């Protein structure tokens, strides 16, 4: 099965009241994993899988860490509001990651963002970033410039980052390895007078990765399409809606097909 | 460029009168950060209401759930109430 770790970096200039200044989460999937804020100033487990299998050493080197690169964040969206002549509250978001696919291939991301739009893009197969406009171009030419660092970032999203997710896989196992299979019911209603309403319900289904559509006479297709949200309880809900007709569902290896 | 919150209110399973459930409250693709929200029965806030962390999606927009758990009745109606800085006033949203 795909899976996947990221590290967001959130950054707000003067915040207003109950607001911080720097947050920092992990995730492995769609679970939070590691937490950072310049309110607590401490990194935190954010998993009970995660607070078990790792030492209070990691939590106390990663306290500092954080701190550092709090400081960082600080300064860089300074530089960038200056660079855009820029007052009041701003935000500067960076996302980074890794995904080992279901064939065993890998992946790697690393972007920034400055007042939730794309910024620079880092393209880790020819060691250079990717401006948005002429501000993220002047950063660009600064962070290009040291090459270590370049292939330092490249070594971690492909070795460092797809080493750690493999470790936290094997933590959370019981968790992130499980499958819950959905529970899906075909409804159908007269809505409004010779209109007849076809709904197709997910609910209680683990992981939130599902494939659901309307196939009418066993092939192809105007489809209403529900998000897939948590239910709260660890587990997902989705829906799709059209207007012989057939609900297919694909979920962890298994194929359900339900007939009106 | 601010984006205002999508609210989706849904029970954690189907709903029947009578039997416990959880009311969630998904509020997401809302940019900046800043966000109220609270479960309302019959107008009043609900006291015991449980939620996650601010979370990120690589959109680099935010989402959270608040939920509480909950025995529906016909008579009694439930929202979620959200404000942000796109909002004039706190939108409240219906379970329907
Ligand atoms: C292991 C842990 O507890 C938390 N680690 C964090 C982290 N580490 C990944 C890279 O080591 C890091 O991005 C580096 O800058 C890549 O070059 N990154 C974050 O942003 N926030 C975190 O909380």
Not at chain 1, 37 to 47: F, I, L, W
Not at chain 1, 144 to 158: D, S, T, V
Not at chain 1, 186 to 194: A, C, D, L, S
């Amino acid at each position: 099965r795909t899976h996947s770790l990221r590290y967001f970096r959130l950054g707000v200039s003067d915040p207003i009241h109950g607001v911080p200044e720097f947050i920092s989460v992990g995730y492995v999937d769609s679970h939070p994993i590691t937490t950072y804020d310049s309110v607590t100033r401490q990194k935190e487990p954010r998993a009970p899988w995660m607070a078990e299998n790792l030492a209070p050493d990691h939590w106390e080197r990663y306290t500092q860490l954080l701190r550092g690169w709090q400081q960082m964040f600080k300064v860089e969206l300074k530089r960038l509001q200056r660079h855009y002549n820029h007052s009041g509250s701003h935000t500067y978001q960076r996302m980074i990651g890794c995904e080992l696919l279901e064939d065993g291939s890998t992946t790697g991301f690393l972007q920034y963002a400055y007042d939730g739009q794309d910024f620079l893009i880092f393209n880790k197969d020819t060691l250079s970033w990717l401006a948005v406009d002429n501000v993220a171009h002047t950063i660009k030419q600064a962070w290009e410039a040291n090459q270590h660092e370049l292939l330092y970032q490249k070594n971690w999203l492909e070795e460092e980052c797809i080493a750690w997710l493999k470790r936290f896989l094997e933590y959370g196992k019981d968790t992130l390895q499980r499958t819950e299979p959905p529970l899906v019911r075909v409804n159908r209603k007269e809505t409004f007078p010779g209109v007849t309403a076809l709904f197709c319900k997910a609910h209680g289904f683990y992981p939130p990765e599902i494939y659901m559509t309307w196939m009418k006479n066993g092939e192809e297709i105007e489809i209403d399409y529900g998000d897939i949200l948590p239910s709260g309880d660890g587990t997902y809900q989705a829906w799709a809606s059209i207007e012989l007709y057939s609900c297919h569902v694909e979920h962890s290896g298994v194929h359900m097909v339900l007939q009106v | 460029i601010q984006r205002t919150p999508k609210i989706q209110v849904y029970s954690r399973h189907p709903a029947e009168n009578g039997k416990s459930n959880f009311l969630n409250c998904y509020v997401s693709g809302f940019h900046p950060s800043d966000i109220e929200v609270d479960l309302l029965k019959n107008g009043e806030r609900i006291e015991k209401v449980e939620h996650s962390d601010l979370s990120f999606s690589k959109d680099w927009s935010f989402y959270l759930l608040y939920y509480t758990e909950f025995t529906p009745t016909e008579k009694d109606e439930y929202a979620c109430r959200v404000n942000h800085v796109t909002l004039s006033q706190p939108k409240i949203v219906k379970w329907d």
